[PDB]
C-alpha cells in the first residue's frame, strides 16, 4: 500500500502470454485498460500470481471473450479503488461476453463513486451471487444484474469457513484462496476490512488501519493532508471527490506521469475541461478555443476502439481525431444508427473513419464540417479510409461545404453496389490520394454495379381534391429512351402527421399500410396521373410518385422520384347520433339521450332536433270488453419478385429482338316544435300530458353558417308515465233508492283522461250473498249518467266503484251504501 509503484499510462492486454506480466510494475493506471478477444492464447498458457502492486485505475475496464482465464487475481489481486472520468457504455465496469472463467479477483474492490455496475450478457460465469452489491456499491435496485445465468444461482461456490468475515450462495467470496470483505449493509460503499464493520467509519472501499482516517485509501469526503473534510479549503481543490490538491500540486500530479491530466475548475482539480477548451502545454491548463475544438479526449497508443453505442469518448466534444478508430458494436441490425449514436456531436473526423451495414440513409449529411486530415499517427495498413457494406448509400458529400483534403492516408472503395462511380472519382480527386501516387486498393468489379444515383424529382401537374377522392396528375416524363419506361409507381398512405417514413409499410407481402398504385406510361402527349377511389372524409394523406423503368444488364437506373405531398380530403354531411334513446323522466317531461355520431366530419356546431305531440284515437276509448409490417392484413400486397424478374426478361427479350432486327435490316454504305343542442348529448322537454305519446326527430350538424348540412333524420316514439291515481272514482256518487228494486247510480268520470278508458267496474254486493259485478261500457255510462239496477235483493247493499282505463290501474273508491228494499 501507500502507492509503492510507478505511475504508468493506459495499456491493454491482447493475444499473448508475454503481456500478462506488465501491470506488475505499475501502481497508478492513467488511461484505458482492456482484455478482449483472446483466441490465440490457450487455457493452460495463463499463470497464477498475486501481487499487491495495483491500487488505482482512472478509466473503465472491459473484459470480452477471454479464453483460458481461470482467475482474476493473476492481474488484479490488489485493486481497491475503481473510478473513471472517461466513460464507455456509461458504466465503469464492463464484463461483456466472458467465458471459461470460474472465479474473480476483486475481493478488495468496494469503492465505486463514478459509474455503475453492468452484469449482463455473461455465459459460464460463476460467483455472481456470492457478491454483495450492497457492499461493493449502492443497493441492487440501482444495478442491472440481469440477463445472466447467475440470476438462478447456477454453479456451486465454496467460501472458506463453510479467513472469511461474518456475512450456490453460502458466504460472500471472490476467489477460492481469498475471502470477500463483508460488513453491515448500512456502510454501503464505505468498504471494510474483515471486522464485520465499516473499515474506519467513513472510508471508501478499504483502509490500512481501522478507526483511522489517515489510512483511508479513499473516503466519502475530499481527503486533505490526513482528514476527510466536507469540502476542500483554498488553495486546495476537489479531486474525483476523494482528494484535495492545490494548483501547484494539481499540475505536478499530471506532470509526474510525463497519461491523464487534471486542471483546476469549479474548485474541482479533476481531469476535465469545459466545452471547447484546448490545452496549452506550459502547465497543461485548460485554455479557451474557438471554432471546432476537440478539448480533452483520450487517444493514447495511437488508437481507440468503439464497441458500445454510447460512451464518453466521442460525446465530450473531441472533434479533431489524433488516434485510430475501429467499430465492433455487438448486436442490432443497423450499424448506421449505432455509429451515429457515438459520433453524433462530432462533425469533423480527423482520424480513421469507416462505415458498415449502411441502412436507413442514402446520403451523408453528418460529416459536413470535415475539411482536413492530419495523419500524423500511422493507421492499420497505412489506410485512413475504408468502405464496405454500403448497400443503402446513394450519395456522397457536396464539394462546397466539405472541402476535405488528405495529407496522410489511403482510399479503399470495396463493396459499394448502390453507389455510382462518379462520387467515387469525386472522392479520389477531392481527397487527393491518387494525386500523391500513394497506393490505393480499388475494386470496381464489385462497385458501380446495380447502382443508382439519379434522383430527379417530378412534380404534380394538376391536383383536384374532393371530400372522398383526390385527383392527381403529374407532368409527362420520359427517360433518355422512350422505350425505357414501365409505368409509374404512385405511393400513398393516410398521414395527419407532419413526419412520416416510407420504409415501414412496404417491402413485404403479408401487410401493406402504404398502398401502391401503378400507371400506364403516357402517350407518345398525355399527363400521367392518379385518382383516388374513395377515402374517409376530412382526412390528411401523404402521396408521392416514383417512375418505374426497364433496367439494363448493366443495372443502370434513369428513374425519377417525385416528392411527398400532404393532401387533405374534405368534409361531408354528419352521421346520425349513435344510440338514440328517448325515455320518460316524469309524467309531464320526457328526456332524450344519445352518443356522438360515427363520423363527425370536423367541428360540430349544433344538433338539429324536432318534436311533436301524438294523440290517441277515440276508437280506443269506445272499445269495451264487457412477415407483416403493420397492423392487420393487406388488401394491396405486391406481386412476387420472380414475376417481376420474368416480365423484365420478356421486356428486354422483345427489346433485344427489336435491336437484332434494326441491325440486320440496315446496312451502311459500301311550425313544428324545434330545439337546438350545441355540442351536447342530452335533451329535455316539458309541458306534456300524462300518458301521451311523442315522436322526436333527431339529426347531427357540423356547419350551419353558409348552408345547413346535417345528418339524416331519426325518430323515436315514447310516452310519459301514466298516473294510476288519476283513475280513482271522483264526483258525488248520488243514489236514487226506490222500494221496487231500482237504484239510479251516479258516479263521475275519473279526474284525468289517462288515455283510453275501457270500462267502469260497478261492484254492487251484499254481505251474506254472492257478489254481483257490472261492466259499464262507454255507451252505458254516457247514456245512464252512471248506472241503474234493474232488479235487486233486500238489505243494505254497497257498491265499490273503480273505473278501468289502461294507464296502470285505479283503486276501488269507498263502497257507497244503498239500502235496497222490496
Amino acid at each position: 500500500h501507500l502507492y509503492p509503484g510507478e505511475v504508468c499510462p493506459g495499456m491493454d492486454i491482447r493475444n499473448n502470454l508475454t503481456r500478462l506480466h506488465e501491470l506488475e510494475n505499475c501502481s497508478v493506471i492513467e488511461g484505458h485498460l482492456q482484455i478482449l478477444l483472446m483466441f490465440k492464447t490457450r487455457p493452460e498458457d495463463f499463470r497464477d500470481l498475486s501481487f499487491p502492486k495495483l491500487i488505482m485505475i482512472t478509466d473503465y475496464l472491459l473484459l470480452f471473450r477471454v479464453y483460458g482465464l481461470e482467475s482474476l487475481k493473476d492481474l488484479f489481486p490488489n485493486l481497491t479503488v475503481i473510478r473513471g472520468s472517461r466513460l464507455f457504455f456509461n458504466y465503469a465496469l464492463v464484463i461483456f461476453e466472458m467465458v471459461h472463467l470460474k472465479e474473480l479477483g476483486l475481493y478488495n474492490l468496494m469503492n465505486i463513486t463514478r459509474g455503475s455496475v453492468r452484469i449482463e450478457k455473461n455465459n459460464e460465469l460463476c460467483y455472481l451471487a456470492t457478491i454483495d452489491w450492497s457492499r461493493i456499491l449502492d443497493s441492487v435496485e440501482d444495478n442491472y444484474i440481469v440477463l445472466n445465468k447467475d440470476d438462478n444461482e447456477e454453479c456451486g461456490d465454496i467460501c472458506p469457513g463453510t479467513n472469511c468475515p461474518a456475512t450456490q450462495f453460502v458466504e460472500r467470496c471472490w476467489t477460492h484462496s481469498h475471502c470477500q470483505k463483508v460488513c453491515p449493509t448500512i456502510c454501503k460503499s464505505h468498504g471494510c476490512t474483515a471486522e464485520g464493520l465499516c473499515c474506519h467509519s467513513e472510508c471508501l472501499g478499504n483502509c490500512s488501519q481501522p478507526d483511522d482516517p489517515t489510512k483511508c485509501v479513499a473516503c466519502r469526503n475530499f481527503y486533505l493532508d490526513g482528514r476527510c473534510v466536507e469540502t476542500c479549503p483554498p488553495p486546495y481543490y476537489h479531486f474525483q471527490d476523494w482528494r484535495c490538491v492545490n494548483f501547484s500540486f494539481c499540475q505536478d500530479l499530471h506532470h509526474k506521469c510525463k497519461c491523464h491530466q487534471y486542471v483546476i475548475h469549479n474548485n474541482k482539480c479533476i481531469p476535465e475541461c469545459p466545452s471547447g477548451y484546448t490545452m496549452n502545454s506550459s502547465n497543461l491548463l485548460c485554455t479557451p478555443c474557438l471554432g471546432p475544438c476537440p478539448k480533452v479526449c483520450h487517444l493514447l497508443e495511437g488508437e481507440k476502439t468503439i464497441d458500445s453505442v454510447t460512451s464518453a469518448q466521442e460525446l465530450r466534444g473531441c472533434t479533431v481525431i489524433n488516434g485510430s478508430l475501429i467499430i465492433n458494436i455487438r448486436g442490432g441490425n443497423n450499424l448506421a444508427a449505432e455509429l451515429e449514436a457515438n459520433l453524433g456531436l462530432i462533425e469533423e473526423i480527423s482520424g480513421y473513419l469507416k462505415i458498415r451495414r449502411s441502412y436507413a440513409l442514402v446520403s451523408l449529411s453528418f460529416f459536413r464540417k470535415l475539411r482536413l486530415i492530419r495523419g500524423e499517427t500511422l493507421e492499420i495498413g497505412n489506410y485512413s479510409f475504408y468502405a464496405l457494406d454500403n448497400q443503402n448509400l446513394r450519395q456522397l458529400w457536396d464539394w462546397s461545404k466539405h472541402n476535405l483534403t488528405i495529407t496522410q492516408g489511403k482510399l479503399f472503395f470495396h463493396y459499394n453496389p448502390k453507389l455510382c462511380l462518379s462520387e467515387i472519382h469525386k472522392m479520389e480527386e477531392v481527397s487527393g490520394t491518387k494525386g500523391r501516387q500513394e497506393r490505393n486498393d480499388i475494386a470496381l468489379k464489385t462497385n458501380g454495379d446495380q447502382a443508382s444515383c439519379e434522383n430527379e424529382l417530378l412534380k404534380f401537374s394538376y391536383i383536384r381534391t374532393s371530400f372522398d377522392k383526390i385527383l392527381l396528375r403529374w407532368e409527362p416524363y420520359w427517360p433518355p429512351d422512350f422505350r425505357d419506361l414501365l409505368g409509374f409507381m404512385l405511393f400513398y398512405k393516410e398521414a395527419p402527421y407532419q413526419n412520416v417514413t416510407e420504409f415501414d409499410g412496404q417491402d413485404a407481402c403479408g401487410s401493406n399500410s402504404w398502398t401502391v398504385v401503378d400507371i400506364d406510361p403516357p402517350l407518345r402527349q398525355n399527363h400521367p396521373g392518379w385518382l383516388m377511389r374513395g377515402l374517409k372524409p376530412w382526412t390528411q394523406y401523404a402521396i408521392f410518385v416514383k417512375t418505374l423503368v426497364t433496367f439494363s444488364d448493366e443495372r443502370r437506373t434513369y428513374g425519377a422520384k417525385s416528392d411527398i405531398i400532404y393532401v387533405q380530403t374534405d368534409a361531408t354531411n354528419p352521421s346520425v347520433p349513435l344510440d338514440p334513446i328517448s325515455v320518460s323522466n316524469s309524467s309531464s317531461q320526457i328526456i332524450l339521450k344519445w352518443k356522438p355520431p360515427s363520423d363527425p366530419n370536423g367541428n360540430i356546431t349544433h344538433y338539429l332536433v324536432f318534436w311533436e305531440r301524438q294523440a290517441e284515437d277515440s276508437e280506443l276509448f269506445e272499445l269495451d270488453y264487457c412477415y407483416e409490417d403493420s397492423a392487420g392484413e393487406c388488401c394491396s400486397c405486391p406481386k412476387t419478385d420472380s414475376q417481376i424478374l420474368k416480365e423484365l426478361e420478356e421486356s428486354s427479350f422483345r427489346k433485344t429482338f427489336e435491336d437484332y432486327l434494326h441491325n440486320v435490316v440496315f446496312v451502311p454504305r459500301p311550425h313544428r316544435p324545434f330545439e337546438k343542442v350545441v355540442n351536447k348529448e342530452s335533451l329535455v322537454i316539458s309541458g306534456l300530458r300524462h300518458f301521451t305519446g311523442y315522436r322526436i326527430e333527431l339529426q347531427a350538424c357540423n356547419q350551419d353558417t353558409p348552408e345547413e348540412r346535417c345528418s339524416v333524420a331519426a325518430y323515436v316514439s315514447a310516452r310519459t308515465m301514466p298516473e294510476a291515481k288519476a283513475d280513482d272514482i271522483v264526483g258525488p256518487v248520488t243514489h236514487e233508492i226506490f222500494e221496487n228494486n231500482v237504484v239510479h247510480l251516479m258516479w263521475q268520470e275519473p279526474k284525468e283522461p289517462n288515455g283510453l278508458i275501457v270500462l267502469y267496474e260497478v261492484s254492487y254486493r251484499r254481505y251474506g250473498d254472492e257478489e254481483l259485478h257490472l261492466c259499464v261500457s262507454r255507451k252505458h255510462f254516457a247514456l245512464e249518467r252512471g248506472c241503474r239496477l234493474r232488479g235487486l235483493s233486500p238489505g243494505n247493499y254497497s257498491v265499490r266503484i273503480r273505473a278501468t282505463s289502461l294507464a296502470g290501474n285505479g283503486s276501488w273508491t269507498e263502497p257507497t251504501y244503498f239500502y235496497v228494499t222490496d
Binding site: 383536384r464 374532393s466 377522392k469 385527383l471 385518382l531 377511389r533 374513395g534
Partner: peptide, 23 residues
C-alpha cells in the same frame, strides 16, 4: 371497392370535367 354508379360518375367527372363525360 369498385367504382360504379355514384363512384363511377364522380370519377368520370373528375378525370373529364372540362369537356364533359357520359355514363
Amino acid at each position: 371497392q369498385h367504382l360504379c354508379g355514384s363512384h363511377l360518375v364522380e370519377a368520370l367527372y373528375l378525370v373529364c370535367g372540362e369537356r364533359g363525360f357520359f355514363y
